[PDB]
Design a protein around this ligand. Structure first.
Ligand SMILES: [Zn+2]
Ligand SMILES: [Zn+2]
Ligand SMILES: [Zn+2]
Lengths: 96, 213, 213
């Protein structure tokens, strides 16, 4: 249910010291030595919530990598109260 | 857009007010009765306009079907909730509306029973064609209207519960459901009103002489 | 609209780091020093873009003067509140920003004192013209930066209390005010950077020979 496109052979090549204001939100191609890396962590992908009043598990919501997603309506008991993320039904992707 | 109204008349059979049955609900029908009470002309919400509480953007041309409804689409993608709306009465569209009450004709009343009334509703150009104290034949549709007064009546009153079979739930903790009463009464929605003679069988002279053959 | 940078150079007098005084804050100056540390080139919020929470409508081209500000004008008339806003860095505008730390020259240090550093900031095209370990002459403006480390220092630290004289109040009941400390340090914002010789007085040969007359 997910296909990632890996763009190869981008023509321009940048070094890390010449990245500037114009390269923000654009595709860059930089060479470098990997120095240190972190462990693989689970990042939310298809987030499912549950309501604390009725207990119903709400439908999957896509989590973009830019910022946290949040919901405020239950569609079952029609309330704006606290909703909780359950990791049992939430789908995750690898992050490093 | 101009609102068009189709008026049917000259039906083969005119039924009594006591011939009204639930098998004809939502069907073209012709009744007759003596007008007793008329209301003033009132506006009825036809094409409502709603503003979303978070969008602050308006959507127009929403169909109103009898009881007051609010859309749940919210086509603008600004927010993610559907139930919250605010109604604007200034730029919404209405229709003429009159609730005229009719009674059973004195020759149609059975041997022991008292006459029974019916609230027939006129919209559009048929409004104010009924006058208190004449015998009128109404052609329209037998509709049904929610009724609260049937609370204490004997018999099993139908109720509507929300079906919860395919929803996933967890017993985490911190059980309420929405259930409605379906009690109704039969009403009439007339499109054509003709005033037959109150007898068994306009002051100017010229306007009267124009009518005769 | 592009950003124009005005670079002044060749001032009559070059001042030391220790000759920097508070009467020259916000004035054009030329200082010199040895660069010891340099920072990564980073984006600085120049023309921010904000969405009002209630409006859900964005405004553009908001000038940012040093510390982060949010406009209270709200030209959209949908809401009546001014303080609440949300920043979108996708369509906001940025500038190049580098903070290089300079130190007193070896001959400019007084008889018994240690050298004192200064964080001079380069923006725009002047970024990455300063290298760690060489003597540089920075021309720019002596600016002032909020400082928190002056909390425990001796002396009366100035504070800014809100003036309440023209505000009508009632003793209805159910007294808090917003007061902030004004503690600051001297920094430099350079528009032109020239690297004088680290001595007392580019591998290809062609690029070197075009330099000489
Ligand atoms: Zn719920
Ligand atoms: Zn909305
Ligand atoms: Zn606003």
């Amino acid at each position: 249910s997910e296909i990632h496109v890996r763009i190869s052979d981008f023509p321009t090549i940048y070094s890390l010291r010449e990245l500037r204001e114009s390269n923000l939100s654009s595709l860059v191609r930089v060479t470098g030595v990997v120095t240190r890396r972190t462990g693989v962590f689970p990042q939310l992908k298809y987030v499912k919530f549950n309501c604390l009043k009725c207990g119903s598990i709400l439908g999957p919501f896509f989590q973009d990598s830019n910022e946290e997603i949040r919901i405020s309506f239950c569609t079952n008991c029609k309330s704006k109260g606290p909703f909780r993320v359950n990791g049992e039904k939430t789908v995750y992707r690898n992050y490093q | 857009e101009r609102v068009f109204q189709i008026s049917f008349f000259n039906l083969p059979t005119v039924h009594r007010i006591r011939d009204i049955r639930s098998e004809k609900i939502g069907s073209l029908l012709s009744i007759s009765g003596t007008v007793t009470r008329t209301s003033e002309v009132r506006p009825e919400l036809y094409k409502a306009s709603f503003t979303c509480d978070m969008c602050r953007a308006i959507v127009d041309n929403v169909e109103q079907s009898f009881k007051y409804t609010e859309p749940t689409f919210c086509p603008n993608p600004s927010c993610e909730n559907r139930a919250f709306w605010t109604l604007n009465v200034t730029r919404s569209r209405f229709l003429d509306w009159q609730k005229v009450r009719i009674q059973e004709n004195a020759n149609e009343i059975p041997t022991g029973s008292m006459p029974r009334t019916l609230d027939v509703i006129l919209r559009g150009d048929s409004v104010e064609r009924a006058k208190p104290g004449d015998r009128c034949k109404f052609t329209g549709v037998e509709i049904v209207v929610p009724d609260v007064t049937q609370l204490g009546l004997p018999g099993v009153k139908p109720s509507s519960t929300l079906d919860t079979r395919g929803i996933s739930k967890t017993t985490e903790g911190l059980r309420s459901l929405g259930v409605r009463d379906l009690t109704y009464k039969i009403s009439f929605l007339a499109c054509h009103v003709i005033s037959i003679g109150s007898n068994i069988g306009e002051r100017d002279q010229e306007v009267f002489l124009n009518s005769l053959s």
